[PDB]
Amino acid sequence: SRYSPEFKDPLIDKEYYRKEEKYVRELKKTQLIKAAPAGKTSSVFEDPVISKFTNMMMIGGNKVLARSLMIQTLEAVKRKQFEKYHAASAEEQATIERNPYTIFHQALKNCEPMIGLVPILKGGRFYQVPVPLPDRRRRFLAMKWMITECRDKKHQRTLMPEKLSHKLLEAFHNQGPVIKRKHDLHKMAEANRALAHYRWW
Amino acid sequence: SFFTKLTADELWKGALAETGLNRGQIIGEGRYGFLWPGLNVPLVQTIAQRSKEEQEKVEADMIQQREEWDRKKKMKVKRERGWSGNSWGGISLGPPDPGPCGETYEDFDTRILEVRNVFTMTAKEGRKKSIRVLVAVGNGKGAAGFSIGKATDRMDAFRKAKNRAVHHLHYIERYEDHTIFHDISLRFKRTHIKMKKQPKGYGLRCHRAIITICRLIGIKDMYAKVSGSINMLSLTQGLFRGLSRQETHQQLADKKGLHVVEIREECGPLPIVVASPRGPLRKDPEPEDEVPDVKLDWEDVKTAQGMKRSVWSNLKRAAT
Amino acid sequence: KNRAARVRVSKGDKPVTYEEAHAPHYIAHRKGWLSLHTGNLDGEDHAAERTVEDVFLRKFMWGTFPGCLADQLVLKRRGNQLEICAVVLRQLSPHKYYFLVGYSETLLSYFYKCPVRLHLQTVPSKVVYKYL
Amino acid sequence: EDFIKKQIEEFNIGKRHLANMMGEDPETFTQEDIDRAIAYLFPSGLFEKRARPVMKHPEQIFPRQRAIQWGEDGRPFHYLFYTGKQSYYSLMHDVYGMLLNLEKHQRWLIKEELEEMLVEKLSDLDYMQFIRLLEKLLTSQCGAAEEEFVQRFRRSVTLESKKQLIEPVQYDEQGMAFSKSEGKRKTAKAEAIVYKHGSGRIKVNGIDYQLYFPITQDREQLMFPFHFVDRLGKHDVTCTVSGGGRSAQAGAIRLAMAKALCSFVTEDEVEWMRQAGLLTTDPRVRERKKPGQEGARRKFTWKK
RNA sequence: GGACCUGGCGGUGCUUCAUAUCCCUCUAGAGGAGCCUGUUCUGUAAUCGAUAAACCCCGAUCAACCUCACCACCUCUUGCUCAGCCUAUAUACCGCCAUCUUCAGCAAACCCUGAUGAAGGCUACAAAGUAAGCGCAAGUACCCACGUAAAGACGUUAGGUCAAGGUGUAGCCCAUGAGGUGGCAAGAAAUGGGCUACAUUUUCUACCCCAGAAACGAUAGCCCUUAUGAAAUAAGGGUCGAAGGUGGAUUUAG
Numbered sequence A: 001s002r003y004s005p006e007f008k009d010p011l012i013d014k015e016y017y018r019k020e021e022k023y024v025r026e027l028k029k030t031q032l033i034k035a036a037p038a039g040k041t042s043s044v045f046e047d048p049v050i051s052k053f054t055n056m057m058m059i060g061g062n063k064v065l066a067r068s069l070m071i072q073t074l075e076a077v078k079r080k081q082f083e084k085y086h087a088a089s090a091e092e093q094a095t096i097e098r099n100p101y102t103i104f105h106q107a108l109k110n111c112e113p114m115i116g117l118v119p120i121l122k123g124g125r126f127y128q129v130p131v132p133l134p135d136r137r138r139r140f141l142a143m144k145w146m147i148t149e150c151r152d153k154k155h156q157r158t159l160m161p162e163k164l165s166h167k168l169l170e171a172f173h174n175q176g177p178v179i180k181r182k183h184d185l186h187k188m189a190e191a192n193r194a195l196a197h198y199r200w201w
Numbered sequence B: 001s002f003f004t005k006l007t008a009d010e011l012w013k014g015a016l017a018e019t020g021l022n023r024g025q026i027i028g029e030g031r032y033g034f035l036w037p038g039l040n041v042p043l044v045q046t047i048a049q050r051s052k053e054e055q056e057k058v059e060a061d062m063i064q065q066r067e068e069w070d071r072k073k074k075m076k077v078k079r080e081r082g083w084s085g086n087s088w089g090g091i092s093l094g095p096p097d098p099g100p101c102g103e104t105y106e107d108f109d110t111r112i113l114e115v116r117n118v119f120t121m122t123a124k125e126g127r128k129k130s131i132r133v134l135v136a137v138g139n140g141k142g143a144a145g146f147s148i149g150k151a152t153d154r155m156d157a158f159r160k161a162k163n164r165a166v167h168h169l170h171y172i173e174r175y176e177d178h179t180i181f182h183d184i185s186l187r188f189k190r191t192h193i194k195m196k197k198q199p200k201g202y203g204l205r206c207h208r209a210i211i212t213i214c215r216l217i218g219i220k221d222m223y224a225k226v227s228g229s230i231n232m233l234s235l236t237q238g239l240f241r242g243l244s245r246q247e248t249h250q251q252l253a254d255k256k257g258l259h260v261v262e263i264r265e266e267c268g269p270l271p272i273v274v275a276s277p278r279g280p281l282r283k284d285p286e287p288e289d290e291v292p293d294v295k296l297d298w299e300d301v302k303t304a305q306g307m308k309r310s311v312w313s314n315l316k317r318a319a320t
Numbered sequence C: 001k002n003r004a005a006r007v008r009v010s011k012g013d014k015p016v017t018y019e020e021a022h023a024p025h026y027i028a029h030r031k032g033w034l035s036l037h038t039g040n041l042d043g044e045d046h047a048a049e050r051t052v053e054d055v056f057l058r059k060f061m062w063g064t065f066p067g068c069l070a071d072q073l074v075l076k077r078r079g080n081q082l083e084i085c086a087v088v089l090r091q092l093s094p095h096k097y098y099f100l101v102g103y104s105e106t107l108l109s110y111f112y113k114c115p116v117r118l119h120l121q122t123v124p125s126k127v128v129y130k131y132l
Numbered sequence D: 001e002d003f004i005k006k007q008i009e010e011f012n013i014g015k016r017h018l019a020n021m022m023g024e025d026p027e028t029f030t031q032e033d034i035d036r037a038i039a040y041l042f043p044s045g046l047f048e049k050r051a052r053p054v055m056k057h058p059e060q061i062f063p064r065q066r067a068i069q070w071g072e073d074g075r076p077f078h079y080l081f082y083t084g085k086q087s088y089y090s091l092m093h094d095v096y097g098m099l100l101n102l103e104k105h106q107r108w109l110i111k112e113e114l115e116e117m118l119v120e121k122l123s124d125l126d127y128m129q130f131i132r133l134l135e136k137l138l139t140s141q142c143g144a145a146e147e148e149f150v151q152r153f154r155r156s157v158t159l160e161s162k163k164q165l166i167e168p169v170q171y172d173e174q175g176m177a178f179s180k181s182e183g184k185r186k187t188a189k190a191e192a193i194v195y196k197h198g199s200g201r202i203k204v205n206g207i208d209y210q211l212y213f214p215i216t217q218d219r220e221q222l223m224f225p226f227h228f229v230d231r232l233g234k235h236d237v238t239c240t241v242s243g244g245g246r247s248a249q250a251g252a253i254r255l256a257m258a259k260a261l262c263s264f265v266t267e268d269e270v271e272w273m274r275q276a277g278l279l280t281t282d283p284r285v286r287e288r289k290k291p292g293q294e295g296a297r298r299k300f301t302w303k304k
Numbered sequence E: 001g002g003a004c005c006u007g008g009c010g011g012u013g014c015u016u017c018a019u020a021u022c023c024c025u026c027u028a029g030a031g032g033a034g035c036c037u038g039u040u041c042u043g044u045a046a047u048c049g050a051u052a053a054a055c056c057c058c059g060a061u062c063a064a065c066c067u068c069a070c071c072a073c074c075u076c077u078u079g080c081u082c083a084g085c086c087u088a089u090a091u092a093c094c095g096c097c098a099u100c101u102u103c104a105g106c107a108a109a110c111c112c113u114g115a116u117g118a119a120g121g122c123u124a125c126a127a128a129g130u131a132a133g134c135g136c137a138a139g140u141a142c143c144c145a146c147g148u149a150a151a152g153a154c155g156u157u158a159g160g161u162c163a164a165g166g167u168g169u170a171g172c173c174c175a176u177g178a179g180g181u182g183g184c185a186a187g188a189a190a191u192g193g194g195c196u197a198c199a200u201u202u203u204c205u206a207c208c209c210c211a212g213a214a215a216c217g218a219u220a221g222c223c224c225u226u227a228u229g230a231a232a233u234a235a236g237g238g239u240c241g242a243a244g245g246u247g248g249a250u251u252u253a254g
């Protein structure tokens, strides 16, 4: 780390920066601050979930190809949902939603797991023990399952925006392999509902 | 190649392998013998070169001087023997080192008594040798004492031991500066020392360590037999304990309030007063306890009755 | 362990000079250089033969002032004026000293073909920076 | 010591001899001028500023040799001599006594500084107990004498200030107003010129931002300071840029525009955007490969 | 044999920790394919040295001849040398290093304790420890005081090199030394490390990231030409168009 430990984290929030924590403000004006990374931005078009998914999709430092495979996915999502409102019906239309950001976010929230499995060694044999997962771990698990179910290699010639758009609309409508594997993790934890007493934490 | 040559300091470091010789030369002597004017011969101003006879004679003198040099290396040094050759037990280290407190120990003689190679185990090294030595210092006038020195080097251990014993001396009281006052029986730990006061001219018929210690103290005539464990570092300690816990004639006279008088068979029935009390004289006589309750030694009674048959006992030995 | 120019610690009785004491990682952080010749800079040609002559000078003067060079020499080289500044001891006779000065003074001039100058600096005893 | 006295004499005479060889033969040759004269006289070229030559009064050169603690009677001078720590224990005794008589009436020194003032070696817990007693004496309502005691033991702080240095406004060109700042990140340099009004325009190496920066990430990096300070289309820029790459150049520009816009935005908001992290350089630079590795921190195959 | 002192060990207890290491975790690989390059084995008339960590693109920041010490054949005798030897011993060594070390100890000299034994020396509301010196630290290099470098003692492992050079001991001098000329570096197999891939975040072309199109993989093999060289390894083109479907156990690095 090229920053000294006294170098502090910069915070970028417009609604904070307009006006208890008054001593925090004075102390922060008396600490050194470190530089802001390139990915974060004072725009409010940004979603941190969206940027995190882009960074996890990145292969070998290509944020260009990453954002490309992300913006094409979002477009393709808007195109299909727009086709939907167009070909729809008086009432159907009011129900269909087409914000490529809410659809991604809510598909991730339906994809996230609530329980997890930890391998615990006891008596030589390894056991799969149910465990409460942290929120950071379950959000990362939802995102990583989505990315691996895009790179499953069972898609053949299909391009990445087509893959992620189809998978993510299925996940928003609560179907597909990511929901299936979350259900599989949940069902295996149930097989293992007694082995949870193996936990010491 | 002169370029691949090296310093001699470096050549020997490799030859000796002690980490796991040019002094007989003048500054201009050459094999060709071109005796110069600033070197060898002083500064008439005439360059010249000696002949085949002067060269051969000078180099013959040089090789002979080398030969006498290897002689002064290969003389023999004479080490006095202590208790045996290749031992350390009677070896006299010198006077104790002069004190940095403007002090001197010049009438003091230091003699070793035991040298042991002592080892402990280390995590990194393993067997680690430390020399442990015991020495005794005395001026033959009563002041003597022993101490242990421990080091990695024997000279350092010797120095530590003697310079510590001069600070840990005793004072031994002597009868007529030749013997002990009485008979001393003492068991120190598991070493039994039995010493008898003896008349003049009896000699030091004691264990060899006791002989050296009593030569450092000034005791000239005494008998001593040691039994049990003969450990040197219990022998010296028990010897010093008994000899420093002697009871003298004046102390006996003061404690009992009576005259302490001598009866020698050499002089006759003549009474020889050796110690009178320095205070009042007690007038009740000493109680003649008939058939005294005293613990006798079976070796002494055996020698008295003549049933002590040994082919080792009264052997003709050298002086002291 | 690194063993390049590091005189190891003995028992605390080993006289040692500033030069010998410092290790190669102090080579211009605390020590500096004993030979100042220009060839090791960016653009020059003859640095190799300068060093080949350098080790020669060190060993010639070591064998020619036998057992009087206290510490190592300073072979500086400005212009064609090679200089062999020295720190030689105070044991041999001054006429012998002036002799070996002259002998060298002319012999390295005829070996290397330039002005060579020895500026001795007599010292009583071999200096001690620290006892290792 | 006679050593110290003759060293002093020799410095004085040599200092005057030093002003002769130079040219300041008038008597007052200061210590800075002494350092200046020896620098030139014999060129250093040694990385350690102690390994270079020097000409100070023997006082600073030679250390503090403690005086003899007993005369020619034996009879040591201080009454607490046989503690071996006369100065420290005399100070602790005194501080305890002032706490006592004050109770009857009613930053901090570092260990090395205290050892320098006492000319005696000290334990860390001894220092800690001394500091504890001194804090007991300030916490207790003490008088002006014990105040000068606490203040001859307390030392300076040398606080710094973390207000961003505002560049002057150069009212120039024909009649416009600008600020010309600089920025650097990952071998890239950007000198930026920002005029107070102008409604938006960049000229990065002659062309606009849509031409020099085809990547929307770079355009976001160029937006960043304006969209923080709510002055998006209210100033205009012109930037010269050398070295680096597609993101390093944009970061250097971002820093330069922020450090130039500081003069056009208020001081509370320049503090606010310093807190937001647009006014500090990024010290993250590429590291060095090492001999025997396969990268800067990357190693080879098997080692265990 | 009894009892100890010190150290090492314990599938040794309690506590506190490791953080790129201890696990759960995170990213990219190895192990599967081809090629390159070391090593083992086989082979040859055909060097030597490294050989768990701490050998295995290692002496080599480098062998067509030279290098070269190997082999074959043929020659030379005060031989470039007040010869020589790359002969044997790294278990005689200097030299320069590996390793613990991604440690903090090593300690002269004293003093005390242990009935003056091997040994041991802790309590800050303090019970005997005091300490020069080396080491960490500190100071320096690079862009900061951060990070990375350098640095890391005593010793351990008779750890690595008599072949870098020097060299003790023992040997040769018709020889084991010296020179010339020509060959030695091949795979029924195996293994270590890399390089490139098995494509769709891909492939080719422009552009150097707003297009068109496709819907793959040899730096191998054979042929041509060129570079350098007395004498071809390298380079470009042509040709071809392998096996290969992201690799189990185990493992590496951050």
Ligand SMILES: C[NH+](C)c1cc(NC(=O)CNC(C)(C)C)c(O)c2c1C[C@H]1C[C@H]3[C@H]([NH+](C)C)C(O)=C(C(N)=O)C(=O)[C@@]3(O)C(O)=C1C2=O
Binding pocket: E089, E091, E157, E159
């Ligand atoms: C046979 N052993 C007792 C032995 C003997 C000698 N030398 C002699 O005794 C010869 N002495 C004469 C020449 C007759 C005077 C030896 O010289 C050696 C060794 C042992 C080896 C072992 C080596 C081995 N290496 C090759 C992998 C090894 O396991 C290690 C290791 N630490 O990894 C070694 O210690 C080893 O390298 C080694 O040092 C040995 C010898 O040097």
Ligand SMILES: [Mg+2]
Binding pocket: B085, B086
């Ligand atoms: Mg004998």
Ligand SMILES: [Mg+2]
Binding pocket: none
């Ligand atoms: Mg190293």
Ligand SMILES: [Mg+2]
Binding pocket: none
């Ligand atoms: Mg070997």
Ligand SMILES: [Mg+2]
Binding pocket: none
């Ligand atoms: Mg040969």
Ligand SMILES: [Mg+2]
Binding pocket: none
């Ligand atoms: Mg290092």
Ligand SMILES: [Mg+2]
Binding pocket: E151
């Ligand atoms: Mg350091």
Ligand SMILES: [Mg+2]
Binding pocket: E090, E158
């Ligand atoms: Mg060996």
